[PDB]
Amino acid sequence: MRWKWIKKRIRRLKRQRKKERG
Amino acid sequence: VIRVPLPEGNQLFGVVEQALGAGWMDVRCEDGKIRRCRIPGKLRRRVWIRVGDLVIVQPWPVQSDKRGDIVYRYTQTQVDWLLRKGKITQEFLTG
């Protein structure tokens, strides 16, 4: 679980933060 | 003697196109429309329907052209009987 979520949250964050940074 | 249910009122013959999940099926009907159909529970427990089965459909009283409930499923020999009485056409079943 919290492994999952942390990396899902991180990937969401990055990918989206990539989309914001871009 | 063989006896086969037939569509009563505004009920329609249909062929099951796609399984959506959760007792909802897309059904191609005999008037030419695809209805999103519900399987009443009283039915789901009694039978195992599948893609490319022929059914009776009861359209809903609102959005008659888009939704219905499947109300009876036909076995393979009933489907043959409905082909031989001219109730359904072989061209309708295949699609």
């Binding site: - | 519900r38 009443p40 529970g41 809903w60 009283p61 609102v62 959005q63």
Partner: protein, 145 residues
């Protein structure tokens, strides 16, 4: 020391504590801001008239299936799209499209649609300023336009 300062002059700490910790009641926070009043259209009100855009029927929930009678109505000043649950058996009949339909809530404003219905926040009382429970009984009055 079970929490709190106790001491003559301290009280202010008390006084701010409570308030700080009050805002963990969703309900309290919400009213004191007025989120109850802003979001779930009405502008807060008891009821709202609106023009019946169309009639739609939706599915029931998890152990259940049955066609509930729901309208789509547009509140007039609110100017917001509301889908809605209609009391009574026959009813959907007595409601013509483009009659006025007064609308209320149903069963705690919290958001809670009743157990069966997914969405429906609201209730309908009226068709052309005469209600639905009056139109379930044949004698009392019967509809127009």
């Amino acid at each position: 020391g079970k929490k709190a300062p106790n001491g003559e002059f301290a009280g202010r700490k008390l006084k701010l504590k409570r308030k700080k910790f009050r805002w963990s009641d969703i309900r309290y926070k919400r009213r004191v801001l007025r989120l109850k009043e802003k979001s779930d259209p009405l502008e807060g009100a008891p009821q709202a008239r609106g023009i019946v855009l169309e009639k739609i029927a939706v599915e029931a929930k998890q152990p259940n299936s049955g066609m509930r009678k729901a309208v789509r109505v547009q509140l007039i000043k609110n100017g917001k799209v509301v889908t809605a649950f209609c009391p009574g058996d026959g009813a959907i009949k007595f409601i013509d499209e483009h009659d006025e339909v007064i609308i209320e809530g149903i069963g705690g404003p919290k958001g809670g649609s009743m157990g069966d219905i997914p969405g429906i926040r609201y209730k309908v009382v009226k068709v052309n300023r005469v209600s639905l429970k009056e139109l379930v009984k044949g004698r009392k009055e019967k509809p127009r336009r």
